[PDB]
């Protein structure tokens with residue numbers, strides 16, 4: 005019932021201004037990066053299941069699901085991966101991301117493409133290419149379901165989730181797309197991006213199409 009507010013590190017805040025203001029074309033790579041993150045989180049629960057199969061029981065299916073919400077201008081990406089606890093969310097997965105954000109920005113100056121972002125472990129922030137506002141709903145076996153949210157601007161919130169559909173286990177990103185990026189709500193377009201950049205993913209990718217009004 006309480007919204008906890010936190011401030012991003014200066015380096016994450018710097019990475020976020022760069023991405024929000026980048027003139028970079030090929031902005032579609034955000035979807036590869038989020039699918040790759042979903043795949044990695046799924047690999048983790050697969051791995052844990054080797055020694056503790058019961059950890060899978062909170063959500064027995066291993067999947068990635070993409071759900072355009074045209075009415076809300078929101079693209080959701082959901083996985084049944086291992087999830088994030090409150091502490092993980094509050095810390096924006098620090099250290100794994102802290103160091104990468106600074107390296108990624110140095111790599112850019114030395115000629116790297118923005119498409120290399122994921123090689124620095126911070127591909128998550130590529131969503132700012134196409135969205136200015138994002139919710140991260142997540143459920144880890146060892147914590148409750150939480151919602152992390154940011155409109156950028158150097159701050160984010162983390163709130164216990166009492167309103168959303170239960171994930172069981174895993175994470176759902178909700179991207180509030182920018183007005184010029186609404187093509188990523190279209191079934192045709194999403195299938196192209198997935199086929200071009202994520203053809204070899206080790207998990208079924210489900211796309212939800214909703215009968216239009």
Ligand SMILES: Nc1nc2sc(C(=O)NC3CCN(C[C@](O)(Cn4cncn4)c4ccc(F)cc4F)CC3)cc2n(-c2ccc3c(c2)N(c2ccccc2)CCO3)c1=O
Pocket residue numbers: 041042045083085086087088089090091092093094095096097101125126127128129140144146147152174175176177
């Ligand atoms: N769709 C996604 N799915 C998952 S799943 C996962 C994971 O590693 N999860 C593990 C789960 C375990 N945890 C440790 C802990 O939870 C700590 N703890 C301890 N006691 C309470 N808490 C724990 C639990 C039990 C235990 F016994 C011991 C433990 F230490 C470390 C993180 C990560 C992700 N990312 C992602 C990728 C890359 C990212 C990001 C996300 N960023 C991000 C983070 C939060 C909000 C917004 C963006 C930052 C940029 O880079 C996704 O997108």
